[PDB]
């Protein structure tokens, strides 16, 4: 018998109300103050003028001079489950990105673009590609690429993190989704899911270690999705009934406009569907 997201799923497909229900999200999401985005000395911290974290979910960065960082904390309480999503970095704030990624104990890094698309540049190349240590002196941390596992859609490359000021490092899981293109959807919930769980499997989901780190570019649209099939499958996985909906909106007050497109928000409820499936 059909599930009630199934027949939801049905329903806006034959009668084609994707483009109405991603406009009602948008008119239905809360905005809240995101002022520090807009402080003159952040104008070269931010890749789009019109994405900025909320004052009261951005991550800060400890103990510099200016804590700020286009980040955002997304802590879903009933999932017990927190994610950072974040833009891809620019070539002045990789220092940053690295500082966030070690204040915040995190373990997995998840990169869902890639460097150059639409022909434009997206994103920094803020790991070493070969092995040459990657310096940023800014922030006082060094990149190394230790290992790389090239699967048909998506590459995992092993970092070592290293804080130079402290002498620790860590290894860093990066996990660079390469076939998901700009504004567009994964090829298959399955490839989508096989990659989610991949991630989870490095344990890096769990509240053990710190918050994993995804980012695309404006971090909001293909990061977005990726957030939003993982904490409804984790809703799902503890047998609370969710409202995909009402989880998108609740995700929505800790970084504005989660999903970027309607064939975004489709492809979310397919991968939740099937994902609900293998539960
Ligand atoms: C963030 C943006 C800006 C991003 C933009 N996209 C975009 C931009 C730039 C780059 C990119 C790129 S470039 C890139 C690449 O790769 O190159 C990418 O990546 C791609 C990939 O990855 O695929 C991406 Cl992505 C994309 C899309 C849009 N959003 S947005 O939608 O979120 C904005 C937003 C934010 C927050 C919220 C809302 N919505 C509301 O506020 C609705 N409001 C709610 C309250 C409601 C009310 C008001 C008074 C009322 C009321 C109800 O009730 C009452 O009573 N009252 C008063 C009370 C007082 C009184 O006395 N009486 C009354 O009646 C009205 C409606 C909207
Ligand atoms: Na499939």
Known sequence: ?????????????????????????????????????????????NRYRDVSPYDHSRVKLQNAENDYINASLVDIEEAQRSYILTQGPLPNTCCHFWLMVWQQKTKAVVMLNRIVEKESVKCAQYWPTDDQEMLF????????????????????HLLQLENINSGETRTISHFHYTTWPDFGVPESPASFLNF?????????????????????SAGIGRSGTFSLVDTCLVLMEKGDD???KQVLLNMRKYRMGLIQTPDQLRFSYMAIIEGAKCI
């Open 137 to 156: 002196k800014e922030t006082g941390f060094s990149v190394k690429l230790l290992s790389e596992d090239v699967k048909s859609y998506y590459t995992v």
């Open 196 to 216: 989610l769980f991949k991630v989870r499997e490095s344990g890096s989901l769990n509240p053990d270690h710190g918050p994993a780190v995804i980012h695309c």
């Open 242 to 244: 969710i409202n995909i």
């Open 1 to 45: 018998m059909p599930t009630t997201i199934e027949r939801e799923f049905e329903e806006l497909d034959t009668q084609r109300r994707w483009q109405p229900l991603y406009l009602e999200i948008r008119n239905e999401s809360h905005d809240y103050p995101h002022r520090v985005a807009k402080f003159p000395e952040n104008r070269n911290r």
